[PDB]
Enzyme design. Structure first.
Site, PDB file in Angstrom:
ATOM      1  N   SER A 246      42.774  33.706  28.902  1.00  0.00           N
ATOM      2  CA  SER A 246      41.339  33.619  29.198  1.00  0.00           C
ATOM      3  C   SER A 246      40.517  33.379  27.926  1.00  0.00           C
ATOM      4  O   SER A 246      39.339  32.943  28.052  1.00  0.00           O
ATOM      5  CB  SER A 246      40.936  34.856  29.922  1.00  0.00           C
ATOM      6  OG  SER A 246      41.631  34.926  31.148  1.00  0.00           O
TER       7      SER A 246
HETATM    8  B1  LIG Z   1      42.681  35.956  31.263  1.00  0.00           B
HETATM    9  O1  LIG Z   1      43.646  35.774  30.314  1.00  0.00           O
HETATM   10  O2  LIG Z   1      42.181  37.216  31.101  1.00  0.00           O
HETATM   11  C1  LIG Z   1      41.284  37.748  32.098  1.00  0.00           C
HETATM   12  C2  LIG Z   1      40.959  39.195  31.797  1.00  0.00           C
HETATM   13  C3  LIG Z   1      40.106  39.404  30.562  1.00  0.00           C
HETATM   14  O3  LIG Z   1      39.185  38.591  30.346  1.00  0.00           O
HETATM   15  O4  LIG Z   1      40.350  40.398  29.846  1.00  0.00           O
HETATM   16  C4  LIG Z   1      41.876  37.620  33.485  1.00  0.00           C
HETATM   17  C5  LIG Z   1      42.327  36.195  33.751  1.00  0.00           C
HETATM   18  C6  LIG Z   1      43.355  35.754  32.716  1.00  0.00           C
HETATM   19  N1  LIG Z   1      44.644  36.481  32.847  1.00  0.00           N
HETATM   20  C7  LIG Z   1      45.449  36.461  33.931  1.00  0.00           C
HETATM   21  O5  LIG Z   1      45.176  35.906  34.941  1.00  0.00           O
HETATM   22  C8  LIG Z   1      46.795  37.145  33.872  1.00  0.00           C
HETATM   23  C9  LIG Z   1      46.740  38.549  34.385  1.00  0.00           C
HETATM   24  C10 LIG Z   1      47.204  39.039  35.617  1.00  0.00           C
HETATM   25  C11 LIG Z   1      46.650  40.334  35.895  1.00  0.00           C
HETATM   26  C12 LIG Z   1      45.939  40.850  34.851  1.00  0.00           C
HETATM   27  S1  LIG Z   1      45.981  39.787  33.527  1.00  0.00           S
END
Ligand SMILES: *[B@@]1([O])O[C]([C]C([O])=O)[C][C][C]1[N]C(=O)[C]C1=[C][C]=[C]S1
Length: 503
Positions: A246
Site C-alpha cells: 500500500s
Molecule cells: B496495503 O499494503 O496496506 C493496507 C493497510 C495499511 O495501509 O496499513 C491494506 C491494503 C494493502 N495490504 C494488503 O492488502 C495485504 C493484507 C491482508 C490483510 C492485512 S494486510
C-alpha cells in the site's frame, strides 16, 4: 642461503571514516603483531616457557608449535595487541621475538552505525559496508623497504625505504550521527514494544539525495564479532527486498493524476470491498465502503479502488512512474550485497497484473529504494541521485513526476496523515507531515510499513519505517510503524533546525 634481500611492505594508515559533521565512525588505531623467527627461537629453548606464559599459551603446545615449523623465518605469536602488551614481551629479551606497529579499526559508535559502516577483517581490509565499498579510497598505498637478512633471516640492517607508504583518504558519510542515534534508539524501542523479529529505518535529505540515517535491527557490535549470527549483520535496508504493498499506491495515483482522466475529488465505487478478475479476487482489508474519492482510496488503502483506476489509465503509466522514482532499479550506491529488487515489465499487461502492481504487489523493493521514491515525490517530483557520502555539490536531479502532480500527491498524503480516519499516529507535533502506511502478509505473519516526509508544505526529510513480524495484536503500518516515524521525524526536524509549518 648465507644471506638474502627480501620485500617488507610499510603499511598505510587507513583513512578515517566520519559522519557528515566529522564525528569519527571508523578509526585506525596503533596495535603490534608479535612475530618470531623459529630458526632463532630454536637456540633459546630455555626461554620458551616464559615467552608462552606471556602469550598466555600452554608451555608444551607453544614448544610443539615452535618445533613443527622450525624452518620458517616467520610465525605470528599474536596478531594485533596494543603497543603496550607488545613491549611487555619485547622487554623479555627472547632471541627471535619482535614487535611491529600495526593498525586496527576502532568504531566509536559501535552497533549504532554497524550496517552502514561495516568493518575490516584481521588484515585491515574492508569486508562489509562502507569499509568494503570504499576500500580503495580508505586503504592507502603500502610503501616498501629493502632489508638485508643473515642466514636465519634476522634483519641485520635496513638498506632503503624505496617507496614510502601513502595514507588512505578521509571519507565523510552522508550519515548525521545525531539522527542515526535517535533512529537506532526508536527502532530498537519499537521492536521491543511489538516483539518484532527485525526492522529498518531510512532518513533521506529530499533535496541532496543524502542518506542521513540507515539503521537495522537486529544489529551487532563491530568491535567484538567473537560470537555473532549471520542475521544480525544483514544491512536489511539495502540487501533485503519486500513487497511495498500500500506504500506505492501514491505512485499509482501520480500516474492517474498525470493521465488527464482523474482529479482528487473524483469518485470510485469499491463496494462490496472485493473484485473478481476471473478466478482471481481482489480483496480490501476494510469492506464498509461504496463511493470513495481519490484521497479516501489512499486513507482506506482500497485495493479494489486503485485497481479500477489502473484498468482506466493502464499499467504502463504505473510501471513507468515506479521505474522513474527508482523502485526495482539500481541505485548506483555499489553497496556490497545491495539488492536491485524486481519491477516486472510486460509487453501485454493483463488485468490481474495491472491490479497487483497498482495496489503494490508482484514487485519487490529495498527500504532505501522506497525512501528514494518518497524523496522524489517530496522534492516536487524531482529525484536527486542517492549518496552515502556527504554531498557538498548537489547533482542535477531528474524531474520524474510533474511538479503540479507531485504537489497534488503531497497534499493527498498530508490528508492521509491529518484527515478523519487518517494515520493520526504519524502526526508530528507543530509540523504538517505527509505519508502512507502499508501492511503485507508473508500462520498470520505481517510486515508493517510507513513512508512519508515533512514538512508537508515544504519537504526536507523522507523517512521509511519497516517493522518485520510484529508479535502483539497490532500489526497495521498505521499502528506499528507510524509512531516511530512521528518520533524520529520530530527529532530529525528539530536537530536540523527546520522551521515549523503548523502554527
Ligand atoms: B496495503 O499494503 O496496506 C493496507 C493497510 C495499511 O495501509 O496499513 C491494506 C491494503 C494493502 N495490504 C494488503 O492488502 C495485504 C493484507 C491482508 C490483510 C492485512 S494486510
Amino acid at each position: 642461503p648465507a644471506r638474502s634481500v627480501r620485500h617488507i611492505a610499510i603499511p598505510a594508515h587507513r583513512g578515517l571514516i566520519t559522519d557528515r559533521n566529522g564525528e569519527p565512525l571508523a578509526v585506525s588505531t596503533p596495535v603490534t603483531t608479535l612475530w618470531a623467527n623459529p630458526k632463532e627461537l630454536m637456540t633459546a629453548k630455555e626461554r620458551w616457557p616464559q615467552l608462552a606464559a606471556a602469550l598466555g599459551q600452554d608451555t608444551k603446545l607453544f614448544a610443539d608449535r615452535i618445533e613443527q615449523n622450525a624452518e620458517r623465518e616467520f610465525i605470528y605469536l599474536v596478531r594485533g595487541l596494543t603497543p603496550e602488551q607488545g613491549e611487555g614481551v619485547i622487554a623479555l629479551k627472547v632471541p627471535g621475538v619482535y614487535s611491529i606497529e600495526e593498525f586496527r579499526r576502532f568504531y566509536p559508535a559501535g552497533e549504532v552505525v554497524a550496517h552502514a559502516v561495516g568493518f575490516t577483517d584481521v588484515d585491515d581490509r574492508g569486508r562489509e559496508g562502507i569499509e568494503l565499498a570504499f576500500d580503495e579510497w580508505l586503504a592507502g598505498v603500502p610503501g616498501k623497504r629493502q632489508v638485508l637478512k643473515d642466514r636465519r633471516g634476522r634483519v641485520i640492517k635496513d638498506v632503503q625505504v624505496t617507496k614510502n607508504a601513502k595514507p588512505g583518504k578521509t571519507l565523510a558519510l552522508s550519515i548525521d550521527l545525531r539522527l542515526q542515534y535517535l533512529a537506532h534508539r526508536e527502532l530498537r524501542n519499537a521492536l521491543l514494544e511489538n516483539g518484532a523479529k527485525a526492522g529498518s529505518l531510512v532518513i533521506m535529505d529530499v533535496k541532496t539525495g543524502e542518506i542521513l540515517a540507515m539503521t537495522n535491527q537486529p544489529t551487532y557490535n563491530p568491535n567484538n564479532r567473537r560470537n555473532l549470527q549471520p542475521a544480525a549483520m544483514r544491512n536489511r535496508a539495502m540487501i533485503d527486498v519486500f513487497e511495498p504493498g500500500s506504500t506505492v499506491k501514491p505512485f499509482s495515483m501520480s500516474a492517474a493524476l498525470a493521465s488527464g482522466r482523474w482529479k482528487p475529488s473524483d469518485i470510485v465505487d469499491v463496494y462490496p470491498g472485493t473484485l473478481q478478475i476471473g478466478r482471481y479476487t481482489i480483496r480490501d482489508v476494510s469492506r464498509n465502503s461504496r463511493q470513495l474519492d481519490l484521497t479516501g482510496i489512499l486513507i482506506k488503502s482500497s485495493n479494489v479502488g486503485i485497481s479500477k483506476i489502473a484498468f482506466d489509465i493502464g499499467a504502463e503509466s504505473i510501471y513507468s512512474v515506479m521505474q522513474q522514482v527508482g523502485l526495482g532499479q539500481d541505485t548506483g550506491l555499489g553497496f556490497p550485497g545491495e539488492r536491485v529488487g524486481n519491477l516486472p515489465n510486460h509487453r501485454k499487461w493483463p488485468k490481474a497484473e495491472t491490479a497487483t502492481l497498482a495496489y503494490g504487489y508482484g514487485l519487490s523493493v529495498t527500504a532505501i529504494q522506497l525512501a528514494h521514491a518518497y524523496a522524489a515525490l517530496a522534492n516536487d517530483g524531482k529525484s536527486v541521485p542517492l549518496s552515502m557520502t556527504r554531498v557538498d555539490r548537489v547533482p542535477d536531479g531528474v524531474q520524474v513526476i510533474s511538479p503540479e502532480v507531485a504537489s497534488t500527491v503531497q497534499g493527498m498524503l498530508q490528508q492521509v496523515v491529518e484527515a478523519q480516519g487518517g494515520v493520526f499516529r504519524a502526526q508530528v507535533p507543530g509540523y504538517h507531515a505527509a505519508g502512507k502506511s502499508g501492511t503485507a502478509r508473508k500462520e498470520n505473519a505481517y510486515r508493517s510499513l510507513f513512508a512519508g516526509f515533512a514538512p508537508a508544505t515544504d519537504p526536507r526529510i523522507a523517512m521509511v519505517v519497516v517493522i518485520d513480524e510484529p508479535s502483539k495484536a497490532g500489526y497495521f503500518g498505521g499502528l506499528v510503524s507510524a509512531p516511530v516515524f512521528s518520533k524520529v521525524m520530530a527529532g530529525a526536524l528539530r536537530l536540523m533546525n527546520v522551521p515549523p509549518d503548523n502554527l
